[PDB]
PDB file of C-alpha atoms and ligand atoms in Angstrom:
ATOM      1  CA  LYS A   1       0.079  -0.217   0.171  1.00 27.53           C
ATOM      2  CA  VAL A   2       1.358   3.483  -0.745  1.00 26.74           C
ATOM      3  CA  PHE A   3      -0.042   5.540   2.225  1.00 24.79           C
ATOM      4  CA  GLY A   4      -0.734   9.437   1.557  1.00 26.49           C
ATOM      5  CA  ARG A   5       0.912  11.483   3.884  1.00 25.96           C
ATOM      6  CA  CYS A   6      -2.023  11.954   5.889  1.00 28.26           C
ATOM      7  CA  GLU A   7      -3.107   8.716   5.889  1.00 26.90           C
ATOM      8  CA  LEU A   8       0.080   7.243   7.220  1.00 26.85           C
ATOM      9  CA  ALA A   9       0.262   9.697   9.978  1.00 26.43           C
ATOM     10  CA  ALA A  10      -3.194   9.023  10.912  1.00 26.95           C
ATOM     11  CA  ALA A  11      -2.017   5.393  11.031  1.00 28.89           C
ATOM     12  CA  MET A  12       0.875   6.162  12.819  1.00 25.62           C
ATOM     13  CA  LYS A  13      -1.080   8.080  14.904  1.00 24.74           C
ATOM     14  CA  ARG A  14      -3.406   5.148  15.488  1.00 21.83           C
ATOM     15  CA  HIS A  15      -0.842   3.122  16.421  1.00 17.88           C
ATOM     16  CA  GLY A  16       1.056   4.891  18.862  1.00 15.78           C
ATOM     17  CA  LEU A  17       3.571   6.308  17.244  1.00 13.99           C
ATOM     18  CA  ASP A  18       3.118   9.727  17.559  1.00 13.62           C
ATOM     19  CA  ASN A  19       5.221  11.046  19.784  1.00 13.14           C
ATOM     20  CA  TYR A  20       6.183   7.672  20.418  1.00 14.49           C
ATOM     21  CA  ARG A  21       9.942   7.952  22.510  1.00 14.33           C
ATOM     22  CA  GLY A  22       9.405  11.384  22.252  1.00 16.40           C
ATOM     23  CA  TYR A  23       8.856  11.625  17.892  1.00 17.05           C
ATOM     24  CA  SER A  24       6.437  13.421  16.453  1.00 16.46           C
ATOM     25  CA  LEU A  25       4.029  12.180  14.180  1.00 17.43           C
ATOM     26  CA  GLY A  26       5.839  14.229  11.708  1.00 16.95           C
ATOM     27  CA  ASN A  27       9.731  12.424  12.501  1.00 19.83           C
ATOM     28  CA  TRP A  28       7.679   9.185  11.702  1.00 18.82           C
ATOM     29  CA  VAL A  29       5.909  10.789   8.404  1.00 14.93           C
ATOM     30  CA  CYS A  30       8.921  12.125   7.268  1.00 11.82           C
ATOM     31  CA  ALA A  31      10.831   8.294   7.840  1.00 12.28           C
ATOM     32  CA  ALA A  32       8.307   7.124   5.824  1.00 11.97           C
ATOM     33  CA  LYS A  33       8.575   8.567   3.707  1.00 13.81           C
ATOM     34  CA  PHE A  34      12.066   8.925   2.951  1.00 13.53           C
ATOM     35  CA  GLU A  35      12.215   5.265   3.603  1.00 14.44           C
ATOM     36  CA  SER A  36       9.359   3.810   1.770  1.00  9.03           C
ATOM     37  CA  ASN A  37       7.857   6.601   0.357  1.00  6.66           C
ATOM     38  CA  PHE A  38       5.142   5.318   2.163  1.00  9.23           C
ATOM     39  CA  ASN A  39       4.899   2.343   0.336  1.00 10.87           C
ATOM     40  CA  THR A  40       4.711  -0.433   2.830  1.00  9.58           C
ATOM     41  CA  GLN A  41       6.273  -2.994   0.555  1.00  8.59           C
ATOM     42  CA  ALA A  42       9.311  -1.629  -0.030  1.00  7.26           C
ATOM     43  CA  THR A  43      11.811  -3.851   0.317  1.00  8.08           C
ATOM     44  CA  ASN A  44      15.485  -2.337   0.047  1.00  8.96           C
ATOM     45  CA  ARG A  45      18.888  -4.910   0.255  1.00 10.28           C
ATOM     46  CA  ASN A  46      21.252  -3.340   2.117  1.00  9.09           C
ATOM     47  CA  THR A  47      24.899  -4.174   1.078  1.00 13.28           C
ATOM     48  CA  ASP A  48      25.118  -5.996   3.755  1.00 12.76           C
ATOM     49  CA  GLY A  49      22.921  -8.590   2.563  1.00 12.57           C
ATOM     50  CA  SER A  50      20.306  -7.333   5.248  1.00 13.84           C
ATOM     51  CA  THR A  51      17.125  -6.164   3.892  1.00  9.57           C
ATOM     52  CA  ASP A  52      14.735  -3.840   4.766  1.00 11.43           C
ATOM     53  CA  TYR A  53      11.203  -4.032   5.110  1.00  9.56           C
ATOM     54  CA  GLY A  54       8.361  -1.859   4.596  1.00  9.42           C
ATOM     55  CA  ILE A  55       7.110   1.740   5.292  1.00 10.66           C
ATOM     56  CA  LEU A  56       9.917   2.649   7.979  1.00  7.18           C
ATOM     57  CA  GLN A  57      12.749   0.174   5.867  1.00  6.90           C
ATOM     58  CA  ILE A  58      13.106  -1.741   9.266  1.00  5.72           C
ATOM     59  CA  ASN A  59      16.369  -4.105   8.577  1.00  8.08           C
ATOM     60  CA  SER A  60      16.605  -7.953   8.764  1.00  7.75           C
ATOM     61  CA  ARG A  61      19.665  -8.305  10.093  1.00  7.82           C
ATOM     62  CA  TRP A  62      18.417  -6.829  13.567  1.00  8.03           C
ATOM     63  CA  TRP A  63      14.830  -6.587  13.782  1.00  9.89           C
ATOM     64  CA  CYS A  64      12.828  -8.871  10.834  1.00 13.66           C
ATOM     65  CA  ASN A  65      13.668 -11.981  10.197  1.00 20.29           C
ATOM     66  CA  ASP A  66      13.460 -12.667   6.712  1.00 24.73           C
ATOM     67  CA  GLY A  67      15.407 -15.815   6.648  1.00 24.48           C
ATOM     68  CA  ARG A  68      18.734 -14.718   4.395  1.00 23.58           C
ATOM     69  CA  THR A  69      20.309 -12.438   6.644  1.00 22.26           C
ATOM     70  CA  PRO A  70      22.887 -14.259   8.020  1.00 23.59           C
ATOM     71  CA  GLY A  71      23.141 -13.052  11.668  1.00 24.04           C
ATOM     72  CA  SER A  72      19.252 -11.509  11.986  1.00 26.58           C
ATOM     73  CA  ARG A  73      18.282 -11.100  15.720  1.00 28.44           C
ATOM     74  CA  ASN A  74      14.699 -11.086  14.572  1.00 29.71           C
ATOM     75  CA  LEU A  75      14.196  -8.617  17.686  1.00 27.01           C
ATOM     76  CA  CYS A  76      10.692  -7.691  16.425  1.00 25.78           C
ATOM     77  CA  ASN A  77       9.900 -10.994  16.292  1.00 23.29           C
ATOM     78  CA  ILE A  78       8.159 -11.017  12.788  1.00 24.18           C
ATOM     79  CA  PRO A  79       9.020 -11.907   9.385  1.00 22.74           C
ATOM     80  CA  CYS A  80      10.208  -9.527   7.898  1.00 21.63           C
ATOM     81  CA  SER A  81       6.787  -9.932   5.475  1.00 22.86           C
ATOM     82  CA  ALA A  82       4.881  -8.765   7.866  1.00 20.15           C
ATOM     83  CA  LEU A  83       6.271  -5.858   7.387  1.00 20.13           C
ATOM     84  CA  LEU A  84       4.604  -5.190   3.717  1.00 17.10           C
ATOM     85  CA  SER A  85       1.705  -5.590   5.449  1.00 15.88           C
ATOM     86  CA  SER A  86      -0.867  -2.525   4.005  1.00 17.55           C
ATOM     87  CA  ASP A  87      -1.654  -2.856   7.928  1.00 20.49           C
ATOM     88  CA  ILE A  88       1.271  -1.106   9.655  1.00 19.50           C
ATOM     89  CA  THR A  89       1.025  -2.545  12.601  1.00 19.46           C
ATOM     90  CA  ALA A  90       3.885  -4.951  12.815  1.00 17.48           C
ATOM     91  CA  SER A  91       6.368  -2.271  11.135  1.00 17.93           C
ATOM     92  CA  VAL A  92       4.687   0.147  13.694  1.00 19.74           C
ATOM     93  CA  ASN A  93       5.253  -2.488  16.827  1.00 22.68           C
ATOM     94  CA  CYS A  94       8.727  -3.028  15.310  1.00 23.90           C
ATOM     95  CA  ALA A  95       9.439   0.743  14.444  1.00 23.52           C
ATOM     96  CA  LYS A  96       8.762   1.228  18.288  1.00 21.83           C
ATOM     97  CA  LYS A  97      11.083  -1.060  19.501  1.00 22.48           C
ATOM     98  CA  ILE A  98      13.617   0.593  16.764  1.00 24.17           C
ATOM     99  CA  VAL A  99      13.550   3.778  18.252  1.00 24.35           C
ATOM    100  CA  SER A 100      13.723   2.574  22.099  1.00 26.63           C
ATOM    101  CA  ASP A 101      17.021   0.919  20.968  1.00 31.58           C
ATOM    102  CA  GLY A 102      18.830   3.421  21.868  1.00 30.25           C
ATOM    103  CA  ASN A 103      19.445   5.922  19.366  1.00 29.82           C
ATOM    104  CA  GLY A 104      15.998   7.468  18.674  1.00 31.53           C
ATOM    105  CA  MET A 105      15.261   7.634  15.387  1.00 32.10           C
ATOM    106  CA  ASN A 106      19.090   8.160  14.219  1.00 30.38           C
ATOM    107  CA  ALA A 107      18.126   4.754  13.771  1.00 31.16           C
ATOM    108  CA  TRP A 108      16.644   5.400  10.556  1.00 32.07           C
ATOM    109  CA  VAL A 109      19.429   6.946   8.719  1.00 32.00           C
ATOM    110  CA  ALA A 110      17.031   8.713   6.601  1.00 31.38           C
ATOM    111  CA  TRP A 111      15.484   9.838   9.497  1.00 31.64           C
ATOM    112  CA  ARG A 112      18.872  11.661  10.562  1.00 30.64           C
ATOM    113  CA  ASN A 113      19.675  12.698   7.175  1.00 28.96           C
ATOM    114  CA  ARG A 114      16.482  13.952   5.919  1.00 27.73           C
ATOM    115  CA  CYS A 115      14.067  14.536   8.684  1.00 30.41           C
ATOM    116  CA  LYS A 116      16.109  15.204  11.624  1.00 31.10           C
ATOM    117  CA  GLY A 117      15.698  18.642  12.484  1.00 32.33           C
ATOM    118  CA  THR A 118      13.676  19.815   9.901  1.00 32.08           C
ATOM    119  CA  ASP A 119      10.317  20.836  10.140  1.00 33.28           C
ATOM    120  CA  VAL A 120       8.857  18.112  10.750  1.00 31.98           C
ATOM    121  CA  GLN A 121       5.746  18.974  11.222  1.00 28.08           C
ATOM    122  CA  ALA A 122       5.474  19.569   7.461  1.00 31.38           C
ATOM    123  CA  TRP A 123       4.850  15.923   7.518  1.00 29.41           C
ATOM    124  CA  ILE A 124       0.915  15.986   8.660  1.00 27.16           C
ATOM    125  CA  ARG A 125       0.732  19.713   8.211  1.00 25.56           C
ATOM    126  CA  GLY A 126      -3.080  19.595   6.853  1.00 26.60           C
ATOM    127  CA  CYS A 127      -3.677  16.386   8.496  1.00 28.76           C
ATOM    128  CA  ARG A 128      -7.014  15.978  10.293  1.00 28.72           C
ATOM    129  CA  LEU A 129      -5.732  12.993  12.557  1.00 29.73           C
TER     130      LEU A 129
HETATM  131 CL1   CL B 201       4.205  13.273   0.497  1.00 32.13          CL
HETATM  132 CL1   CL B 202       5.331  16.794  14.446  1.00 30.45          CL
HETATM  133 CL1   CL B 203      18.257 -14.299   8.102  1.00 31.97          CL
HETATM  134 CL1   CL B 204      15.753  10.114  21.436  1.00 32.62          CL
HETATM  135 CS1   CS B 205       2.453   7.877  21.688  1.00 35.10          CS
HETATM  136 CS1   CS B 206       0.767  12.612  20.991  1.00 34.67          CS
HETATM  137 CS1   CS B 207      16.413   1.995  -3.594  1.00 34.08          CS
HETATM  138 CS1   CS B 208      19.920  -1.058  -2.891  1.00 34.93          CS
HETATM  139 CS1   CS B 209      18.781   0.478   1.737  1.00 36.27          CS
HETATM  140 CS1   CS B 210      19.553   1.093   4.495  1.00 35.43          CS
HETATM  141 CS1   CS B 211      15.978   1.908   3.609  1.00 34.76          CS
HETATM  142 CS1   CS B 212      21.008  -1.663  15.854  1.00 35.05          CS
HETATM  143 CS1   CS B 213      16.805 -16.646  10.958  1.00 34.21          CS
HETATM  144 CS1   CS B 214      18.903 -15.263  11.169  1.00 33.03          CS
HETATM  145 CS1   CS B 215      13.998 -13.001  18.198  1.00 32.75          CS
HETATM  146 CS1   CS B 216       5.493  -9.152  16.964  1.00 35.96          CS
HETATM  147 CS1   CS B 217      20.520  -1.403  22.219  1.00 40.12          CS
HETATM  148 CS1   CS B 218      21.472   0.866  19.600  1.00 39.92          CS
HETATM  149 CS1   CS B 219      19.965   1.247  10.754  1.00 42.35          CS
HETATM  150 CS1   CS B 220      17.813  22.293  10.590  1.00 41.97          CS
END
């Protein structure tokens, strides 16, 4: 599913992401935007052999099991494929763990590089929510 911006904001909020670990919804939306362009089905192989999955491009090295990432810890206890669902629950659940892992949203390099410090509120601007 390719979420719309506000749609995803809403779904993220619905799933308790808004201000989760103090990251406003705009941060999450922004992260999703640059991670997956709001496409729940986004997958992108990392140079290391891991793959990132889903709206938040959760990595199969640490967070989900894709069965092909030697070392996978699967810390979200989720098949990575579950991170590709139109329903973002798994992604959100796992992102909650990731963002809790110590570096906040810097876990998402694209968040750090593209969202962090920016007017992330823009991402939810106009959204009903
Ligand atoms: Cl957008
Ligand atoms: Cl925000
Ligand atoms: Cl694996
Ligand atoms: Cl933080
Ligand atoms: Cs929350
Ligand atoms: Cs909130
Ligand atoms: Cs890409
Ligand atoms: Cs790639
Ligand atoms: Cs990647
Ligand atoms: Cs990456
Ligand atoms: Cs990525
Ligand atoms: Cs990690
Ligand atoms: Cs495995
Ligand atoms: Cs593994
Ligand atoms: Cs595990
Ligand atoms: Cs789980
Ligand atoms: Cs940690
Ligand atoms: Cs960490
Ligand atoms: Cs990372
Ligand atoms: Cs800035």
